[PDB]
């Protein structure tokens, strides 16, 4: 069972660095929040 | 007019008749004999119910307490009667009784 | 038995508009987008958008 878990746990699709993959999502989130406050306190 | 109660009567929302000949004497006895009634519901509905009760059968010292709401299909009234008579006029043991219902909010469970 | 009904309704309308004001404050408080104190990466970008935008 640990051998099958070892063959499954280290897939090429998993168990790696998604930190950049969600860091880019975080960056575009901050940028759309930036433009959101742009369009907000243009008139706030 | 001396026995205390805080009985709560619901009031549905018919077309233009605003009460029931099924239920008119029972809901006028309380407003005639009460001392402080309150009204919960829609704004103009509790206004016209205060107008209707004062113009039909109430008296000039009830001190209608109105607290309006928004999302309330219907309008609920609570009629209370403080004793305020100076002879003796004491409350019987705050009715810890399994036979009778306590005379603040009745919660009437009966068919037989 | 006597009509005698005026003047005791503006107080009630004031009560209705006060409950309306409370509902409006609850609706305004239901927000996820406006001011809520965040980390420095959010807040410096926020303050910069305010400043560059007042100049704009």
Author numbering:
A (entry chain C): 225 to 268
B (entry chain C): 57 to 168
C (entry chain B): 169 to 224
Study text:
The H. pylori Cag T4SS is of particular interest because of its role in translocating CagA (a bacterial oncoprotein) into host cells, an important step in gastric cancer pathogenesis. Here we report the use of single particle cryo-EM to determine the structure of a transmembrane Cag T4SS complex extracted and purified from H. pylori. The structure can be divided into three major regions: the OMCC, a periplasmic ring complex (PRC), and a central stalk. The OMCC has a structural organization markedly different from that of T4SS OMCCs in other species, and there is an unexpected symmetry mismatch between the 14-fold-symmetric OMCC and a contiguous 17-fold-symmetric PRC.
Adjacent to CagX, we traced a continuous chain 243 residues long corresponding to CagT. It includes a globular subdomain consisting of two β-sheets followed by a long C-terminal extension of three helices that contribute to the spoke and extend toward the edge of the map. A predicted lipidation site within the N-terminal tail of CagT was not observed in the cryo-EM map, but the N-terminus of CagT is positioned for this interaction with the outer membrane. Consistent with the limited sequence relatedness of CagT to VirB7 homologs, there is relatively little structural relatedness when comparing CagT with VirB7 except for an N-terminal portion that contains little secondary structure. Using symmetry, focused refinement, and symmetry expansion, we determined a 3.7 Å resolution map of the OMCC and a 3.5 Å map of the PRC.
